[PDB]
Amino acid sequence: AMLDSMQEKFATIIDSSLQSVEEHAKQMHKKLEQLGAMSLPDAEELQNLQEELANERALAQQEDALLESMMMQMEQIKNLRSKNSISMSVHLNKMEESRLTRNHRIDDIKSGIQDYQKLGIEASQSAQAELTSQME
Amino acid sequence: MSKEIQTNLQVIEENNQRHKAMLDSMQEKFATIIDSSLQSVEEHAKQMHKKLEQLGAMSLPDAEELQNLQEELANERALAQQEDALLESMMMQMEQIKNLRSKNSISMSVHLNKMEESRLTRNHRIDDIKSGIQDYQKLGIEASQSAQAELT
Amino acid sequence: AMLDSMQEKFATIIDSSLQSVEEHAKQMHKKLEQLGAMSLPDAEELQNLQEELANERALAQQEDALLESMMMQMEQIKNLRSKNSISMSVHLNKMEESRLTRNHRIDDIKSGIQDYQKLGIEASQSAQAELTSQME
Amino acid sequence: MSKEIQTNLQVIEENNQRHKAMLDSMQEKFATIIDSSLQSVEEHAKQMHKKLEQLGAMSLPDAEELQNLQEELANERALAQQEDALLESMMMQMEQIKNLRSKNSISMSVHLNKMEESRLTRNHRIDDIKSGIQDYQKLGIEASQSAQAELT
């Protein structure tokens, strides 16, 4: 029974094998721990991009509201100008009538002065027609 | 008295002469002023007519000014028409850019969700592998006992 | 003295002449009154054009203030977007580093599994080197 | 006892045979498991290596997604650059239209002042003519008296 000296080598290799299976299990699990630890910063970065995307939506919404408001006010001014411009064309037309009318009135007065000069000659001849008539 | 009647007829021959040269000088002097009277009516009519000439002469410059106001009013509509075209064009283009942005930002959210799936999947796989290391270490130590309990 | 009968015609023409000089003076002055009356509506029309011109100035001033304000706000949004876009490029670069790093860590673990398979064969030969050695 | 020693040597000849075929079967059975042990270490190493293969295979799609995010970011700058060019262009043009309007409105005020002068001048001329009618009627009635006071 020289087996007692052979089996002492049996616990020496089974134990030395198991200690390597646990050192591999220890080493790998440490590597897998820190690898899986990257998940949180990765999630962090996504949340940041997510927030920046929401800012873009916020900003686009403010921009659209701003331009609409600007266009609104811009349209009111356009209408006011248009009303103001129509008012002008009307007053210019009135002034054109008042100018033509003034011309007619001036021509009437010119004609009336001519009528006066005409009827003055008619009076001069009609008066000398009495003075040459009272020559009898 | 035949000679006496002849001189009484000389009296009359000068008597009417005293009325003739007196009336001939009255109608000559009265007609000399009616003529000067018409001359004041014609010089006043000329004077006044000149005034009305230069007054009516203002009409054409008045019309020039109105016509200038007319042109400046038409320019204003021109400018108003350019301004409206410009803003319309601008709004047109701004609207495309807005749409392109929205399409681009939506595409982005898709990739962000895509990536979040890829992150969760990655975690499951890491956990799956971690479990396999635990499974190996457990079935490894339990295998050692099955050998040490028989030969020892 | 048959002049008393001639002078009665003298007051008849001097009076008839003067009454025509006053009827002309009356008629003309009436014409000149209403002609000069056009001055007030003419002045009115000018004042209206004057007010419409001031409206144009008012309107142009509002328009200039409006566009300036719009441009201001438009510039703030541009800057905010630009800051938001720079922030993105930064997070994308971080994620690219975290991806490369993750690749190195995975390769290390792959290599460490290979080292384990290698040193397992070294153990298998070294163990059978004892079992073929204890054949003596 | 010569025959007796031969059989005691047969005992030993089977005694060591009882240890030989017992040890030959112990190292054959012990080496038969060290071989199966390495086989579990190599199949686990293969199994795990597969897991790491498909996990590392996620890297390329991850890179594709980042590259898409990169392109969508560059598009956004493109769109931002078009938008700024557009508004600049628009402001440029709006500024000319504004100037042209001011020039046009100032021209107008000049004509309005021009016309107001022409209106005041017109009034002086009307008053001047009215005065001439008064002057004529006054110097006309006073002329009538100078004649009626002498002949009447």
Residue numbers in the entry:
A (entry chain B), C (entry chain B): 660 to 795
B (entry chain A), D (entry chain A): 640 to 791
What do the authors of the reporting publication say about this deposited model?
Of these, the MT-based motor, Kinesin-5 plays a key role, being essential for the assembly of bipolar spindles in most eukaryotic cells and driving or constraining the rate of spindle elongation. Purified, native Kinesin-5 is a ‘slow’, plus-end-directed, bipolar, homotetrameric motor capable of using pairs of N-terminal motor domains at opposite ends of a central rod to crosslink MTs into bundles. Structure-function analysis of the Drosophila melanogaster Kinesin-5, KLP61F, identified a central bipolar assembly (BASS) domain within the coiled-coil rod that is critical for this motor’s bipolar organization and whose deletion results in disassembled, mostly monomeric, Kinesin-5. Instead of the expected antiparallel arrangement of two side-by-side parallel coiled-coils proposed previously, we find that the BASS domain has a novel four-helix bundle structure, which very likely has important implications for its mechanism of action within the spindle.
We purified a minimal BASS domain construct that assembles into a tetrameric, 220 Å long rod based on EM (KLP61F residues 635–835). This BASS tetramer formed hexagonal (P6422) crystals, which were used to determine its structure to 2.6-Å resolution using X-ray crystallography with the single wavelength anomalous dispersion (SAD) method from selenomethionine-and mercury-derived crystals. The asymmetric unit contains a canonical anti-parallel coiled-coil BASS domain dimer encompassing residues 640–802 of both chains, which represents the basic assembly unit of a Kinesin-5 minifilament. The resulting four-helix bundle, which is 22 Å wide, 26 Å high, and 260 Å long is the longest helical minifilment structure determined to date, and it displays a striking organization. It consists of a 220-Å-long central bundle that is visible by EM and matches fairly well to other anti-parallel four-helix bundles, where helical axes are separated by equal distances but then transitions to an asymmetric diamond-shaped bundle near its ends, where C-terminal helical axes become displaced and N-terminal helical axes are closer mediated by helical bends, termed elbows. The hydrophobic central interface (A) is bracketed by an ionic interface (B), another hydrophobic interface (C), and finally another ionic interface (D) positioned at the ‘elbows’ marking the transition between anti-parallel four-helix bundle and parallel coiled-coils at the ends.
